[PDB]
Ligand binder design. Structure first.
Ligand SMILES: O=c1[nH]cc(F)c(=O)[nH]1
Ligand SMILES: [Ca+2]
Ligand SMILES: [Mn+2]
Length: 237
């Protein structure tokens, strides 16, 4: 049923399902088997930052992930998102753990979307920026194990009081309002997403990752989408 486009920060290589032999970024059209990837030098415990972009002229989805003091990693993939995704969509952040685990912690998240038409002065827009997550955050649809307000943060995966991550966990956060990505009289459509995070683990091998995703508006966590499926897909096809 559900329909997914996402940019994965895969902290654990499941090389039997096409993950490279290390931590990587990647771009998932309707399949966790990333159509493109590139190497990611994840840093256990540092605050990393993620920049997603597309426009309907270039029909290319490109992302850049960047720790301070450090080189960025970038990946891109040419796709017409209008030939993939429904005309109305919800955007979100997903992450997960299996028998390996990490903190999956959003410190900030900031979407922008524009439709500009043939007409004079006719942009249509939605921005949001969260630098501080509330306990009762009514503009976010929290799903599965995702919680807010903990040091004013979004906790995609489960954490215990003391402050360390639980395995076999999946959670997502979706912005309450739909996003129009296409309109008949569109001449350029665009979107960018930024978000910062703190993946952290007591282990040399953390799993599984964080995705920023764009989905149908009724999208929900598919069964057994813990671990390698990142809360996005029900299987690995
Ligand atoms: O891309 C968008 N344009 C206008 C809107 F109101 C919205 O939610 N999304
Ligand atoms: Ca993986
Ligand atoms: Mn991958």
């Amino acid at each position: 049923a559900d329909t997914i486009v996402a940019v994965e920060l895969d902290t654990y290589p499941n090389t039997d399902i096409g993950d490279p032999s290390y931590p990587h970024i990647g771009i998932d059209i309707k399949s966790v088997r990333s159509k493109k990837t590139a190497k990611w030098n994840m840093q256990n415990g540092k605050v990393g930052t993620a920049h997603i972009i597309y426009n309907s002229v270039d029909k290319r989805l490109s992302a850049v992930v960047s720790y301070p003091n450090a080189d960025s990693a970038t990946v891109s993939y040419d796709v017409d998102l209008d030939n993939v995704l429904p005309e109305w969509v919800r955007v979100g952040l997903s992450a997960s753990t299996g028998l390996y685990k990490e903190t999956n912690t959003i410190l900030s998240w900031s979407f922008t979307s524009k439709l500009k038409s043939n007409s004079t002065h006719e942009t249509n827009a939605l921005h949001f920026m969260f630098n501080q997550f509330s306990k009762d955050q009514k503009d976010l649809i929290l799903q599965g194990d995702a919680t807010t307000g903990t040091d004013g943060n979004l906790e995609l995966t489960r954490v215990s009081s003391n402050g360390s991550p639980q395995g076999s966990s999946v959670g997502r956060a979706l912005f309450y309002a739909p996003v129009h990505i296409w309109e008949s009289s569109a001449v350029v459509a665009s979107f960018e997403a930024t978000f910062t995070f703190l993946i952290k683990s007591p282990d040399s091998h953390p799993a599984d990752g964080i995705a920023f995703f764009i989905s149908n508006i009724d999208s929900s966590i598919p069964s057994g989408s813990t671990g390698r499926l990142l809360g996005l897909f029900p299987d690995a096809n």
